[PDB]
Design a protein around this ligand. Structure first.
Ligand SMILES: Nc1ncnc2c1ncn2[C@@H]1O[C@H](COP(=O)(O)OP(=O)(O)NP(=O)(O)O)[C@@H](O)[C@H]1O
Ligand SMILES: Nc1ncnc2c1ncn2[C@@H]1O[C@H](COP(=O)(O)OP(=O)(O)O)[C@@H](O)[C@H]1O
Ligand SMILES: [Mg+2]
Ligand SMILES: [Mg+2]
Ligand SMILES: [Mg+2]
Lengths: 184, 747
């Protein structure tokens, strides 16, 4: 009938798919490239910017930007390009037909959620959506109602203790160490 | 009032559900009734009810229970009891429905002279008989090409198979003949072997709906038959309650194990294997499963399943049995392993032609693949057991669909089917001291069939009201849609159950808690049992039924890992095992969702068609010929919805009279002043005097329509008038004769 889209914006990899299948059928880096060299050959079909695996393939000639840094979306037009690419190119699904479920790290600014929702309703016209905490979903994934989740992606690391399905919001710890600054 | 001296009433009694009593002093508004019994009694009249009044004897015994003026449980039970015991009639109409009572005796009524007597006759013409339903379906099919169904419902042992047999014998006789009926009757032993199980109340209960389509050519010759099946009870293959068995075939197979052919299977006695062992009761009294095996193989031969395929089938079933013995040791909270050199798994792999190391690996691990990348990861002993039992259930369901398709290959014929008449044998509403996921599915299927019945009857009433030009508004529809939306809507009991299956740390206590949350006080049909927090009550059409939650999560889980199927698909030892699968989301579907889908396929098959209903009832448990038990029958009339059908007809205009026969009956009331030669206007004049309320009857074009009470009230006042006239005349005669003897006394 209608099945929600499930999308986790992360930093680095985007991974997206349909609710109730078991692994994401779109996975690609959340990266946008713009060409920086003078183009010489006339009539090449040269393109203003590249997204995801395109920008990985051509990365020799591109400046690569990450639109998400430490779970905060710093650049919004590139994030809209990444979602447009996800829905139309990767999933080939029109977003008006499906609820969308979106994932976020705890303790990050509220403006990030307000903008994510304003964009999903106004530009995509998604009929319904929700924003979920990254750590909470790892318990659903591991079959538990209790535990202290330690989560680290690119960017933010956070601990979230949960006990029989109640979060303990005064005990949430967040750390900016993980993943990109290991590479730097 | 109606309660006068010499009235009669039904009073409740412990040992037969109702007994007759005569009202020994007329009632006035208050608390007392003096009653006399066929001796002397006084009965408390108490909240409020008056005791059910009794029909005048002219109505008792008539061929149609809706001809009764008072419609209520004891009048129905009395008319069936008198027709069966005294007349030895076994068939009785209720409205559209034919009620059929199992005589446990042979009868002459199925002779071909009677077949011919029924042919071409409409239901009004002749006393009810199953041929009178078959002939109606046949002529409905002739008039209009629309296919016809015949639907047969009741507890197993009520004679549904013999009813279908004579129903198709009718078609064979009227069309002439193509040897369908022999093949169809020869198929019954295998379908009963694979599809029937002992149950706490009943041996040879059928756990699936069987639909036989008899196809006709443009001549309405019998071409041939096609067989479908629905609503199979898959969960029984792996779990049974106490005093229940697995499907008969498993015990026929185990008992055969000593035979030379089956030696290679290494079968044991039936309480060795985990799936047969659980029920407690390996041996049915009065059946030799080893002998039944012979009839099963014989019917396989007659339908032309080669003995190669027969040994394939028994191989696969011994596979399922040996698989059930596979036992997992948990090496961690999240990992398990099969103990080394495991004899059950060694025999299962030998039987099935698979590499021991691949089954031993895939039983304990499951595989997930992202589009670029695949991870193998362990699973707990609980998920391993749930997946082994889902594999056994999936093998069994595919073997069942295969045996059904090889029967269909034997029954089909090459002539293109112009149209068909189809016969549905299905279980009726079910209630035991313990009620469980099986009973919940059965009662939901019966709620669906009862809705489609009520809506067909409502359609036919709107047609008859058009035919008599009576306003439609007088009849109201009685809709069990709220109970269906209770069971199957989103946030329904099945929906919350399928949620709680995937939910982490789901359990029958938290499922029950979600039930009480969503529906404890929002729906009138859902109730919590007073003393328990583990059970729930649904008010079904027939009765309130209390279900225990404690089983449903184990029974509801199916998930089949693709790698375990692909191991079996890889088998080359024998050809049947890869043939079964030959055929992705369905592997994720729960048993409840597969059931709801098979039920939607069934409702699509039936809604396409025009139904005719037969209800079968089983008058006594002990199979005594032509004995009747009121407390058994009231249970089965309730479960067959006959009593609710009658309740729904008792509101409205159940009693209908032709003006001719009405006038003939009640000339005695009419004064010779007001008898016109037009009967209809006389009747319209008279009934308004005799009955005050125009609401209580309607003047149709050709028939008078009465509400329930009125015809018995007219019969009462008629009888009292005729009593007064008789007494007055006979006192005059006696007076003359004594005056003559006085004339002698002067002389
Ligand atoms: N109309 C009938 N005339 C004679 N015997 C009947 C009739 N209906 C049922 N019986 C007897 O009832 C018994 C069982 O009938 P049958 O049609 O075989 O039911 P069944 O096999 O139990 N199918 P099911 O009710 O679903 O379990 C047999 O002894 C039949 O002879
Ligand atoms: N096998 C691996 N070993 C070590 N680091 C890895 C591995 N795979 C990914 N990473 C690093 O982890 C980060 C990606 O983690 P991911 O969960 O995809 O981030 P997010 O949660 O933001 O989507 C990147 O910095 C990547 O370099
Ligand atoms: Mg992440
Ligand atoms: Mg029988
Ligand atoms: Mg049967």
């Amino acid at each position: 009938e209608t099945t929600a889209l499930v999308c986790d914006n992360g930093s680095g990899l985007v991974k997206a798919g349909f609710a109730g299948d078991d692994a994401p059928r779109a996975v690609f880096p959340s990266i946008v490239g713009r060409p920086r060299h003078q183009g010489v050959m006339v009539g090449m079909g040269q393109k203003d910017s590249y997204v995801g695996d395109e920008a990985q393939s051509k990365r020799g000639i591109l400046t690569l930007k990450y639109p998400i840094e430490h779970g905060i979306i710093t650049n919004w037009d590139d994030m809209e390009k990444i979602w447009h690419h996800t829905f139309y190119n990767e999933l080939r699904v029109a977003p008006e037909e499906h609820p969308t479920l979106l994932t976020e790290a705890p303790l990050n600014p509220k403006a990030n959620r307000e903008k994510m929702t304003q964009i999903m309703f106004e530009t995509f016209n998604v009929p319904a959506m929700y924003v979920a905490i990254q750590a909470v979903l790892s318990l659903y994934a591991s079959g538990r109602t209790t535990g202290i989740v330690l989560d680290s992606g690119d960017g933010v690391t956070h601990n979230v203790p949960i006990y029989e399905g109640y979060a303990l919001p005064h005990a949430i710890m967040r750390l900016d160490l993980a993943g990109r600054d290991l590479t730097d | 009032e109606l309660y006068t001296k010499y009235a009669r009433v039904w009073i409740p009694d412990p040992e037969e559900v109702w007994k007759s009593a005569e009202l020994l002093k007329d009632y006035k508004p208050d608390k007392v009734l003096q009653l006399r019994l066929e001796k002397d009694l006084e009965y408390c009249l108490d909240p409020k009810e008056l005791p059910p009044l009794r029909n005048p004897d002219i109505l008792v015994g008539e061929n149609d229970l809706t001809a009764l003026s008072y419609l209520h449980e004891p009048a129905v039970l009395h008319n069936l009891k008198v027709r069966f015991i005294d007349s030895k009639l076994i068939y009785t109409y209720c409205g559209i429905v034919l009620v059929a009572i199992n005589p446990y005796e042979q009868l002459p009524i199925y002779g071909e002279d009677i077949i011919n007597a029924y042919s071409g006759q409409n239901m009004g013409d002749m006393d009810p008989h199953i041929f009178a339903v078959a002939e109606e379906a046949y002529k409905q099919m002739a008039r209009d090409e629309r296919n016809q169904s015949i639907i047969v419902s009741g507890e197993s042992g009520a004679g549904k198979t013999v009813s279908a047999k004579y129903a198709m014998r009718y078609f064979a006789t009227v069309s002439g003949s193509a040897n369908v009926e022999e093949k169809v009757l020869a198929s019954n032993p295998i379908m009963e072997s694979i599809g029937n199980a002992k149950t706490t109340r009943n041996d040879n209960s059928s756990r699936f709906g069987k639909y036989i389509e008899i196809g006709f050519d443009k001549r309405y010759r019998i071409i041939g038959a096609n067989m479908r099946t629905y609503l199979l009870e898959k969960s029984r293959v792996v779990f049974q309650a106490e005093e229940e068995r697995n499907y008969h075939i498993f015990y026929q197979l185990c008992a055969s194990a000593a035979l030379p052919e089956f030696k290679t299977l290494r079968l044991g006695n039936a309480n060795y294997f985990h799936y047969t062992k659980q029920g407690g009761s390996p041996v049915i009294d009065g059946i030799d499963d080893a002998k039944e095996m012979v009839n099963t193989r014989q019917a396989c031969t007659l339908l032309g399943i080669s003995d190669s395929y027969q040994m394939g089938i028994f191989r696969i079933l011994a596979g399922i049995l040996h698989l059930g013995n596979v036992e997992f040791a948990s090496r961690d909270s999240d990992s398990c392993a099969i103990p080394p050199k495991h004899d059950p798994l060694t025999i299962f792999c030998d039987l099935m032609g698979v590499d021991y190391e691949e089954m031993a690996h895939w039983l304990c691990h499951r595989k997930l693949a992202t589009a670029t990348e695949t991870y193998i990861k362990p699973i707990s002993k609980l998920h391993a057991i749930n997946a082994r039992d889902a594999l056994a259930k999936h093998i069994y369901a595919n073997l069942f669909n295969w045996i059904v398709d090889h029967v269909n290959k034997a029954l089909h014929s090459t002539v293109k089917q112009h149209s068909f008449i189809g016969v549905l044998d299905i279980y009726g509403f079910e209630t035991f001291e313990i009620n469980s996921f099986e009973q919940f599915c059965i009662n939901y299927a019966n709620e669906k069939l009862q809705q489609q019945f009520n809506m067909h009857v409502f359609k036919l009433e709107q047609e008859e009201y058009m035919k008599e030009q009576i306003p439609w508004t007088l009849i109201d529809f009685y809709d069990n849609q709220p109970c269906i939306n209770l069971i199957e809507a989103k946030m329904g009991v099945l929906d919350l159950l399928d949620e709680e299956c995937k939910m982490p740390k789901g359990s029958d206590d938290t499922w029950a808690q979600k039930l009480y949350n969503t529906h404890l006080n929002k729906c009138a049909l859902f109730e919590k049992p007073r003393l328990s927090n583990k059970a729930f009550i649904i008010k079904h059409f027939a009765d309130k039924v209390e279900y225990q939650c404690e089983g449903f999560l184990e029974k509801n889980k199916d998930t089949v890992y693709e790698e375990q199927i692909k191991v079996l698909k890889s088998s080359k030892k024998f050809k049947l095992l890869p043939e079964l699968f030959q055929d992705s989301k369905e592997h994720k579907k729960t048993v409840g969702h597969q059931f709801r889908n098979s039920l939607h396929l069934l409702m699509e098959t039936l809604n396409a068609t025009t139904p005719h209903y037969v209800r079968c009832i089983k008058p006594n448990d002990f199979k005594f010929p032509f004995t009747f038990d009121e407390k058994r029958a009231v249970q089965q009339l309730r479960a067959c919805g006959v009593l609710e059908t009658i309740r729904i007809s008792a509101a409205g205009f159940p009693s209908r009279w032709t003006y001719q026969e009405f006038f003939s009956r009640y000339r005695v009331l009419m004064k010779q002043k007001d008898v016109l030669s037009d009967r209809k206007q006389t009747c319209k004049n008279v009934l308004e005097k005799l009955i005050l309320d125009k609401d209580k009857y309607q003047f149709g074009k050709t028939k008078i329509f009465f509400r329930a009470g009125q015809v018995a009230y007219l019969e009462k006042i008629r009888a009292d008038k005729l009593r007064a006239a008789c007494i007055r005349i006979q006192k005059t005669i006696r007076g003359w004769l004594m005056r003559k003897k006085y004339m002698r006394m002067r002389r």
